[PDB]
Amino acid sequence: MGKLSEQLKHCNGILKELLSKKHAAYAWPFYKPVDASALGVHDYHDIIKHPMDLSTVKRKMENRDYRDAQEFAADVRLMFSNCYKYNPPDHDVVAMARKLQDVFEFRYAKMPD
Ligand SMILES: C[C@H](O)COCC(CO)(COC[C@@H](C)O)COC[C@@H](C)O
Ligand SMILES: C[C@H](O)COC[C@H](C)O
Ligand SMILES: [Cl-]
């Protein structure tokens, strides 16, 4: 598949961290694709045109779908944005998203040049 670039190695590290036990208390809703029918959110796919979640990001990284760090970051941010779009701003899951996004943005900002 070829070695990830230095920047994508950093991205992969961030991704592993987002999936790790120490963040699980707020990361878990983002682990897998939203199963709209299971949750009874029958409007989800009308509102969210481009679903994204951490398992999908992981598969894309493994498959070398991301050609650079920017493409990776856009997907992670899309995942958070979908949460902010679908849910009311006082929802517990929105607070979880904000916390995980803090983890993400601060470490993404430490990207090697
Ligand atoms: C503390 C609990 O209320 C957290 O609920 C999460 C869930 C239920 O497991 C899944 O959220 C997935 C994110 C990606 O939106 C909230 O589900 C409602 C819509 C899908 O957000
Ligand atoms: C909570 C906002 O949607 C995302 O903020 C990220 C910042 C690094 O805390
Ligand atoms: Cl972006």
Author numbering: 343 to 455
Please give sentences taken from the publication describing this entry.
These four human proteins – BRD2, BRD3, BRD4 and BRDT – each contain two tandem bromodomains that bind acetylated lysine residues in histone tails, leading to the recruitment of multi-protein complexes to chromatin. The phenotypes generated by said inhibitors have been used to investigate the functions of BET proteins and their significance as therapeutic targets. This process has been limited by the pan-selective nature of the BET inhibitors, as they typically target all BET bromodomains with similar potency, hence specific proteins/bromodomains cannot be associated to specific phenotypes.
The L/V mutation typically decreased the affinity of the peptide:bromodomain interaction by around two-fold, which is close to experimental errors and a significant improvement over the L/A mutation which showed up to 10-fold decreases in affinity. Analysis of the thermodynamic parameters of binding (ΔH, TΔS, ΔG) suggested that the L/V mutation does not substantially impact the binding mode of these peptides. Re-orienting the ZA loop during binding might be contributing to the varying affinities observed between WT and mutant bromodomains for acetylated histone peptides. However, differences in crystallization space group and consequently crystal packing around the ZA loop amongst the various crystal structures might also contribute to the different conformations observed for the ZA loop.
